[PDB]
Amino acid sequence: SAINVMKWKTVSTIFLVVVLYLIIGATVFKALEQPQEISQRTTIVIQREKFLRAHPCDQELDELIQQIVAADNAGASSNQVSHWDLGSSFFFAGTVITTIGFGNISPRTEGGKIFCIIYALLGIPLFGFLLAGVGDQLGTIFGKGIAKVEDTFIKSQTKIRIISTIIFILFGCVLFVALPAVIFKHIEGWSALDAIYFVVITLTTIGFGDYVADFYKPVVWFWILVGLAYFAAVLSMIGDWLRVIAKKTKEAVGEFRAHAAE
Amino acid sequence: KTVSTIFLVVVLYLIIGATVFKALEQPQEISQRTTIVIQREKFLRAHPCVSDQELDELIQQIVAADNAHWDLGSSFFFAGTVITTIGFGNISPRTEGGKIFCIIYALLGIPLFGFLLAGVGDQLGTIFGKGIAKVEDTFIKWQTKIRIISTIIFILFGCVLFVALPAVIFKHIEGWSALDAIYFVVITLTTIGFGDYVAGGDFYKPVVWFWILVGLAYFAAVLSMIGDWLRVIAKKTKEAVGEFRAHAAEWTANV
Numbered sequence: 363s364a365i366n367v368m369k370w371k372t373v374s375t376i377f378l379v380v381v382l383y384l385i386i387g388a389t390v391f392k393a394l395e396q397p398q399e400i401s402q403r404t405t406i407v408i409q410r411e412k413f414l415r416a417h418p419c420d421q422e423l424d425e426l427i428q429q430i431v432a433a434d435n436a437g438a439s440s441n442q443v444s445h446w447d448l449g450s451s452f453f454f455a456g457t458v459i460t461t462i463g464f465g466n467i468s469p470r471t472e473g474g475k476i477f478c479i480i481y482a483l484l485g486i487p488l489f490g491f492l493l494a495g496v497g498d499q500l501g502t503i504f505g506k507g508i509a510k511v512e513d514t515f516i517k518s519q520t521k522i523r524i525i526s527t528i529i530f531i532l533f534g535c536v537l538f539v540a541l542p543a544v545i546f547k548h549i550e551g552w553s554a555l556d557a558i559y560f561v562v563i564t565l566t567t568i569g570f571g572d573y574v575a576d577f578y579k580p581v582v583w584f585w586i587l588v589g590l591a592y593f594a595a596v597l598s599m600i601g602d603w604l605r606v607i608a609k610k611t612k613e614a615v616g617e618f619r620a621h622a623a624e
Numbered sequence: 625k626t627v628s629t630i631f632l633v634v635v636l637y638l639i640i641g642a643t644v645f646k647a648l649e650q651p652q653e654i655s656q657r658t659t660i661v662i663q664r665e666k667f668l669r670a671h672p673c674v675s676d677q678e679l680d681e682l683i684q685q686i687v688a689a690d691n692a693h694w695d696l697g698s699s700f701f702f703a704g705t706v707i708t709t710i711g712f713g714n715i716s717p718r719t720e721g722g723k724i725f726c727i728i729y730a731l732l733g734i735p736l737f738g739f740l741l742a743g744v745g746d747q748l749g750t751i752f753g754k755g756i757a758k759v760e761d762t763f764i765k766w767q768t769k770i771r772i773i774s775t776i777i778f779i780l781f782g783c784v785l786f787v788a789l790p791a792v793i794f795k796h797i798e799g800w801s802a803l804d805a806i807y808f809v810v811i812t813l814t815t816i817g818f819g820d821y822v823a824g825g826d827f828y829k830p831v832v833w834f835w836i837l838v839g840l841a842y843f844a845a846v847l848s849m850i851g852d853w854l855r856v857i858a859k860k861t862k863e864a865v866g867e868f869r870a871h872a873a874e875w876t877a878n879v
């Protein structure tokens with residue numbers, strides 16, 4: 363089991379890198395959010411006691427808020443709109459098989475949960491075959507257009523790969539990031555950032571849910587379908603970049619430690 | 625193409641799924657929402673002063689307080705959700721810089737985490753590789769069919785270690801139900817992560833993330849096996865329709 367140690371060595375080193383990466387990330391987020399956290403939560407204590415002494419008609423303001431936060435975990439106008447309607451249950455399933463899972467709508471029935479479990483364990487693999495085919499299809503659609511555009515530059519075989527990938531990322535980021543984010547900004551009424559924030563969080567299959575988007579809805583899911591293929595390639599390229607940088611900082615430390623002051 | 629045929633299958637699968645969910649949830653939806661109109665008027669009637677005009681104001685500000693933790697630890701767990709693409713959403717950035725950082729952090733963290741999980745998976749797959757090699761030879765001197773006893777051992781033990789036991793731990797600790805625990809486990813380790821249940825809602829919180837790390841490797845294999853069985857069944861039903869359509873009409877020749 364020689365290489366098995368040569369592997370465990372290499373997983374452990376990656377482990378500590380990720381732990382570092384998270385610690386670095388952890389520090390940066392709480393440095394960027396905890397100020398806004400306190401400002402928003404002192405201004406909520408202001409609004410509490412502004413509504414208390416302006417209506418002393420009281421432990422039970424609380425027992426309203428508990429019932430409103432109990433109305434949080436399910437979403438004039440005493441008649442509301444339907445979450446689980448003909449359409450939102452389709453989009454819900456779409457989030458389940460794509461592993462996005464925004465959580466804006468989630469099952470509360472015990473049977474719905476059990477169904478959601480079985481639906482995912484079968485839907486996630488099934489969707490993978492679709493996305494794999496959609497990705498393969500799109501990658502070969504590119505393959506034709508890139509083969510056309512490279513021969514017009516073969517005025518070396520090696521540096522034209524780089525112009526190629528830049529064409530790829532540029533176009534894709536126009537088609538799959540810029541344009542649908544603009545459409546969301548103009549429709550969902552988001553900011554220039556919240557749109558691009560939504561696009562990434564969705565197509566990176568993270569899906570927090572803080573932002574979630576009858577011709578509009580289908581184009582969104584189909585966008586998600588093809589965009590997930592796009593970031594699949596994008597994230598895959600970034601993984602290669604990292605391997606390059608990782609094993610070329612590995613040679614650079616081998617440089618230093620052998621030279622180690624001349 | 626074969627992609628178009630798969631496309632329509634998924635569409636059909638979603639339509640089937642769509643119908644089943646709204647049949648399972650929209651009843652509870654209305655029951656919960658008529659009993660909220662009851663509670664609204666019950667609080668209007670019963671507080672002549674907290675009148676109609678003093679209530680929606682508040683609810684909008686409370687649902688604006690739904691919009692919103694961030695301590696030494698929760699920001700670590702947040703980053704853990706970002707690189708694992710789980711993203712429960714229970715805590716999400718509100719600063720414009722935090723969002724921009726979250727974007728850059730994910731585009732770099734997601735690939736980085738994949739290498740870890742790939743190594744953790746490879747490591748765990750070879751740890752089983754030893755234990756399974758020892759349990760198969762005891763069934764050989766006793767073979768294409770021993771593969772099947774093997775995978776059943778795999779799924780059983782893994783479901784015990786990675787699903788049953790940590791769900792029980794959550795049920796005692798987070799005070800969940802027998803289902804909500806297993807519901808949480810799947811939704812987390814299938815990297816879906818709705819957020820309706822989160823173990824984060826100091827010995828406990830590290831073991832959870834490390835559990836997630838290794839469990840994600842487990843369902844990675846599980847979902848991968850399920851993909852193969854689908855590929856089998858898809859190809860087995862492809863031959864079966866070729867069976868029917870030729871035999872259908874072996875008969876059609878006879879006139």
Ligand SMILES: CCCCCCCCCCC
Pocket residue numbers: 476479480483802803806
């Ligand atoms: C507490 C009961 C939980 C039942 C879960 C059954 C899951 C069946 C999975 C079939 C693929």
Ligand SMILES: CCCCCCCCCCC
Pocket residue numbers: 484633854857858859861
């Ligand atoms: C619930 C059992 C059926 C699972 C899906 C079957 C997929 C068949 C694919 C045909 C190409």
Ligand SMILES: CCCCCCCC
Pocket residue numbers: 379382
């Ligand atoms: C953010 C840089 C991490 C460097 C890790 C050091 C191990 C070579």
Ligand SMILES: CCCCCCCC
Pocket residue numbers: 636
């Ligand atoms: C199992 C539900 C879908 C069945 C489709 C059969 C493939 C043509």
Ligand SMILES: CCCCCCCC
Pocket residue numbers: 724728
């Ligand atoms: C305004 C944000 C631009 C997107 C950041 C890209 C980081 C590589």
Ligand SMILES: [K+]
Pocket residue numbers: 461567709815
């Ligand atoms: K994934």
Ligand SMILES: [K+]
Pocket residue numbers: 461462463464465568569570709710711712713816817818
């Ligand atoms: K999610």
Ligand SMILES: [K+]
Pocket residue numbers: 461462566567568708709710815816
């Ligand atoms: K995910």
Ligand SMILES: [K+]
Pocket residue numbers: 571713714819
């Ligand atoms: K939320």
Ligand SMILES: [K+]
Pocket residue numbers: 461462463567568569709710711815816817
């Ligand atoms: K997710």
Ligand SMILES: [K+]
Pocket residue numbers: 462463464465466569570571710711712713816817818819
């Ligand atoms: K979520």
